[PDB]
Amino acid sequence: SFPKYKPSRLATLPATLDPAEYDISPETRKAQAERLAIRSRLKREYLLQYNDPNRLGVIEDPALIRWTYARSANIYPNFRPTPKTSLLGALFGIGPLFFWYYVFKTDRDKKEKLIQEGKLDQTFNISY
Amino acid sequence: GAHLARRYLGDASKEPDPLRMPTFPPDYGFPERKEREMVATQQEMNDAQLMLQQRDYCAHYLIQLLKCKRDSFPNFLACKHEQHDWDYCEHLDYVKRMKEFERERRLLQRKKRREQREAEMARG
């Protein structure tokens, strides 16, 4: 009837256009009930300490600690040398260095060769 | 535009090239051409510090206008005659440039047609 909208990585699909939310099952209703149960339990836990008159300081969040620890300290223990990991490391850590070395070496060789022939227009080039 | 349409759609071989112009020598169609004369000396133009783009054959009127502008400073509505004269002689210079362009155009078209006709006569 109307032109379709196709989602992308940086422009996702709207909730009202998701087929999965218009074909439902009582299993899905049960899953939503459990989701709301966990969220309500966590909210109650937060609000109990949030309103405590005798609480002074920062309410420690295990989720934040987990996030930071996973992002920083848990990476090397779970690292395995695989063809993908090794190839990506070699590429992203070696290719740029040699590419830039080639570029700068070529430019400087051209500059020096022009200097030797005496045609560079180096007048007023006092500061270096 | 009509010149652009003629050169870019019609036959551009008989259309003058603004970058490469003139292609004919100045005394070809004229038995004699008078040399254009300049009224303001190099030293006067240097001392007035007009600009490198205002130092054309029209600089005398510009110097006069600047002098009368400086003299009647608070009355900024008094230098109308000098401005009008400078604008008029600018307009004359522009008209001369149009004359040169049209002369070059008719020279090219006439010469090309005459060469084609001479070749046709020599081909029969």
Partner: protein
């Protein structure tokens, strides 16, 4: 003023035209100039007169330090450390003096570019030539020495240039 020598820092004779009024209207610029004079330049002049009168009561002098010439690095043996030290200090002082000379010429060029207005391209080309000459000489002397420069490196550069010029001249002679 006489604070600086006018031969090292020359100027044109500074021609200025006389005012030629052509209108009956008053000129506000001269009125404002009179007000500015009477309201600013006179109190400042009085304060400066007081300052100079106080200074003239306590007059004392300071002197320019004079350095004699010591043997250059060419009169220096391979491992005579003391003569090397003296020659190296002399070379450094000459380097600073040369830099100041180039600075003076550059100031002259800037003064021309500002003063001449719209005719700077033609009216002050002599100083452009002066700067070109002094810059070429400075570049021949000191350029490409890099950090850790010394009298020995400059001498080696001069010897290399002399050898190249002598070879080129001897080749051109045979042509």
């Amino acid at each position: 003023p006489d604070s600086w020598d006018k031969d090292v820092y020359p100027e044109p004779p500074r021609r200025t035209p006389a005012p030629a009024p052509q209108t009956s209207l008053p000129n506000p610029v001269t009125y404002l100039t009179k007000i500015f004079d009477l309201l600013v330049d006179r109190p400042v002049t009085l304060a400066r007169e007081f300052i100079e009168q106080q200074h003239a009561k306590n007059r004392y002098y300071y002197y320019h330090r004079e350095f004699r010439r010591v043997p250059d690095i060419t009169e220096c043996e391979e491992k005579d450390i003391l003569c090397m030290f003296e020659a190296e200090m002399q070379w450094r002082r000459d380097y600073k003096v040369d830099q100041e000379i180039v600075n003076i010429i550059q100031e002259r060029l800037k003064a021309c570019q500002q003063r001449e207005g719209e005719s700077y391209r033609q009216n002050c080309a002599k100083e452009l030539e002066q700067f070109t000459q002094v810059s070429k000489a400075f570049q021949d002397r000191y350029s490409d020495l890099g950090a850790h420069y010394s009298a020995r490196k400059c001498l080696a550069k001069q010897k290399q240039r002399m050898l190249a010029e002598r070879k080129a001249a001897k080749e051109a002679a045979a042509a």
